[PDB]
Symmetry: C2
Subunit: 557 residues, 2 copies
């Protein structure tokens, strides 16, 4: 209840407008009307003449026409009139998506398929399925400005992307994957909004003034009317679930979500989701268990959370990288602790933030966290979106892959990565306000040295995937993904871990694994049969003793 | 460790100055020196020539002299040189102060005794003791600007007020009360700082930029170097405890204390205090149990918290008051719920904040909260600090008194109130920067209509207590305070409560009480003996039946 609501033959027009005195419905074809201002600040009207897949603008006091922020869909620009659509209405009391079986495929509909749409991505299902992926994670489809964006300027939480196809398409996309037995997971932004087409600002207070994130400012969940906005959001998740049988959510940078209330909005959301028996994952920098934490432990519940701590340890280890966050790591030791204690910052000094970061993760299964060697962020904000292939010796790139998919955690593959993709993932925008298409520039430029003027199709397309398979890499992947299942490696943190100066051997419940980054001697403490190696130098049937190995990765049993 | 530290014959000069490149110790008599800049940002020096009860200024890069923010004492202005003092060092592993026996006397050393000092307040001990008060709560003694302030512009957390006597005095004050068997409780401000003499600002980041309270902005407990500042504070409480055997703390507006860390600074402090087996109470607007909440329940622990909810219900009830917050109440019903469910806003709609305020207090004894009919705030910010005597029929004023002291809560009397004080408590400042002594004006003026130019001795002295006893009122009090003890009324929330249209009868463990605000018939359901009445119309030995009563209060058994 916020956008519109088709009854029988009749339709309503709710509209949170505290700041307004006079608001006017305006079917573009039909006419202009007067909303029933309720004391709380909710203008409102009721229609029946309408059925009309009609455009409409809300015209306020000031004498300005604007679009329904709960816009079901914005046919034209992020200034297009909002529009009537059908009531998908149907979805199911669940997700087939069981947590353990979780292989995530991060995708970016745009730069993905050369079509760059759902249709585009629909073509790859069976491919995806082939791969073994247990589910798909879509990057933000919240109507952003232009046609070229990661989707982090989504300024229409309710309206499904124009370009990407939209509604029916996105609609179709799920119904599709659904049949392919694939799960879909939408990654939604609740900690902020788009710098273009944002008309919250004139309807009332949607965003707190107390605080200031980096990208502008979060919404208002605390002060003055929190009540409403906090509902906005909360309804927003419900929508997805029913209007699109979505399988799960992925929350962007929760830690920019500020709440002081006795009940943190997160926990508020989690419940909405778990209510429909769906899943939630969140991007959180704060090495805090709270999030993913259980109800008994007064945690928000959130099903799972990303652990960049993993990534980083590995990355800076393989690369001789020490910039920005990389400075907190770049070492073997890190890799192991992360491997056994989810966070590398368990409550210790980050010189990076000159603070005392994170704190001990519980006794939570590996499945409360999701690991990766790649993601839009990690590639994306490099200045030249270098994939990781471009910075590591081939054997390495293979090793890494192993590391992560072989974790109890919840392995998620960036798009491309599996088949050995070398294209880059660039920072691209599609703004219109001069000051935007500018500020941005010195931004990405000053922030990350990106040269590729994001506001250039160039930068764009150059990130489009070059479906150039590499069966070496591609093969591997499938295998890994496969062994993982076989082995029952998931969630389980009952692991034994060793490493030497440059090696590392990890026992598990059903095996051992060998990581050697440099020819060296290993006192292999066990006998198993080679299950998979990165090389050929690997001994099908191993036994306990000293052995000299070559830079490579081998997997026993 | 932050100010200085006298060793044997030698003394250190720590000094958090991240932003500084070159810092200089400067004994005013002796000389100027160079601090040992540590990477973390801590300049530093070591002395022995010194013993000297010497003044000193830290002279930074910019070529400016300034005083030790951990100033033990600021002899001259809030620009005076800091100064050497002795190492009180001694205190005890405890407080005689048991929580139940808790009668708080809120005092304001300045406007109190005509002397307006500790010495002044020392003269009243035995008086106080006489009253029955179980302990004293001092308003902020943190070096503020000028000589006339509530003390809410304290800008020197470590330095004891000049005017109020200072150190040795405050020192003496406690050692005194200690002997009188009286407990002392300092009310310290950690959510903000004084608008004059604040030199944190140039030493580095002491205060977060993420947020903005009302009175400027809180410190930085979250970001960049939180680590340090969070220690500042935390050491600050330790000081009080050892350098002054203080008995407890009272925290100003905690809810302006913003922390996202896994461990809320509050909980951080609580521990410091409970570590020394001392007590903590906090001013919190957020109807959140979290604070006062226990460790098992993942609460901050804080021993007790103020419940304005109480006050208000009563006040607006007795007064026909409905301004500002008064709008959320002004009703009988409120009075009872507050009486049985600590908060009146247990998670419901405050039109006052157009939000959904508070939430259910546990099953916490009445002793987690502290009630009052008066306090500096409630009088102080009225525009004409009207005491409550000035707005209620005499019988009322007596009734109220009963209400609160007869609660399981932790009754605290404002100063004056007990003996029937009619003087007002005004908003007074003693600033020097023109813009201050001005902004303030339209402030207090625009905020509360205060006319009494706070920057006028007038406004000041006029708040000084007129020790004009009124033995009627005065007597009552003592009695109440006395019965309370007798009765064992404290902490216990096992109460039965009734009211009629204008009356109210409250059973307890050892009695009943009758509140009648308007001649009416009461179906008194019990037999007891008059223990104390506000009037004479009260029936020494009561029995169950209908009886007509007169506006008044009576107490049975």
């Amino acid at each position: 209840t916020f956008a519109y609501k088709i009854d029988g033959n009749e339709v309503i027009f709710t509209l949170w407008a505290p700041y307004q005195k006079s608001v006017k419905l305006k079917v573009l074809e039909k006419g202009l009307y007067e909303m029933e201002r309720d004391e709380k600040g909710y203008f409102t009207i009721t229609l029946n003449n309408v059925k009309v897949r009609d455009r409409y603008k809300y015209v306020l006091d000031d004498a300005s026409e604007i679009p329904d922020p709960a816009s079901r869909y914005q046919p034209e620009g992020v200034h297009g009139p909002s529009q009537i659509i059908q009531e998908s209405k149907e979805f199911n009391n669940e997700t087939f998506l069981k947590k353990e079986d979780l292989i995530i495929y991060e995708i970016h509909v745009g730069t993905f398929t050369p079509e760059g749409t759902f249709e585009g991505v629909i073509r790859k299902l069976d491919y995806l399925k082939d791969l073994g992926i247990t589910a798909i994670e879509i990057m933000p489809i919240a109507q952003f400005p232009g046609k070229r964006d990661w989707g982090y300027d989504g300024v229409y939480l309710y309206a499904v992307q124009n370009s990407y196809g939209g509604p029916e398409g996105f609609r179709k996309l799920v119904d599709e994957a659904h049949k392919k037995g694939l799960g879909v997971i939408l990654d939604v932004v609740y900690n902020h909004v788009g710098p273009e087409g944002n008309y919250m600002v004139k309807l009332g207070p949607y965003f707190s003034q107390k605080y200031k994130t980096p990208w502008g400012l979060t919404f208002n969940f605390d002060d003055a009317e929190s009540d409403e906005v906090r509902k906005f959001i909360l309804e927003n998740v419900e929508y997805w679930i029913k209007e699109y049988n979505v399988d799960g959510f992925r929350l962007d940078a929760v830690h920019a979500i500020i709440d002081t209330s006795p009940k943190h909005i997160l926990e508020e959301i989690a419940d909405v989701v778990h209510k429909y028996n769906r899943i939630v994952i969140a991007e959180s920098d704060l090495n805090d268990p709270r999030v993913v934490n259980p109800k008994e432990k007064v945690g928000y519940n959130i099903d799972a959370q990303w652990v960049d701590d993993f990534h980083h340890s590995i990355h800076a280890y393989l690369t001789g990288e020490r910039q920005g966050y990389y400075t907190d790591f770049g070492n073997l030791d890190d890799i192991v602790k992360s491997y056994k204690d989810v966070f590398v910052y368990d409550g210790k000094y980050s010189n990076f933030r000159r603070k005392t970061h994170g704190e001990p993760v519980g006794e939570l299964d590996g499945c409360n966290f999701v690991v990766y060697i790649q993601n839009h962020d990690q590639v994306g904000n490099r200045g030249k979106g270098e994939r990781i292939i471009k910075l590591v010796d081939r054997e390495s790139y293979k090793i890494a892959a192993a590391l992560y998919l072989l974790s109890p955690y919840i392995p998620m593959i960036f798009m491309g990565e599996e088949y050995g993709e070398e294209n880059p993932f660039y920072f691209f925008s599609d703004f219109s306000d001069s000051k935007l298409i500018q500020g941005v520039r010195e931004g990405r430029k000053k922030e990350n040295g990106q040269d590729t003027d994001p506001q250039d199709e160039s930068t764009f397309n150059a990130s489009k995937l070059s479906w150039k398979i590499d069966e070496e890499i591609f093969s591997f992947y499938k295998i890994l993904i496969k062994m993982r299942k076989e082995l029952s490696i998931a969630c389980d943190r009952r692991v034994n871990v060793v490493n030497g100066e440059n090696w590392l051997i990890i026992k598990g419940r059903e095996y051992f694994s060998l990581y050697v980054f440099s020819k060296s001697s290993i006192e292999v403490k066990y006998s198993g049969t080679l299950l998979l190696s990165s090389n050929n130098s690997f001994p099908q049937h191993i036994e306990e003793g000293k052995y000299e190995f070559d830079k490579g990765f081998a997997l026993y049993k």
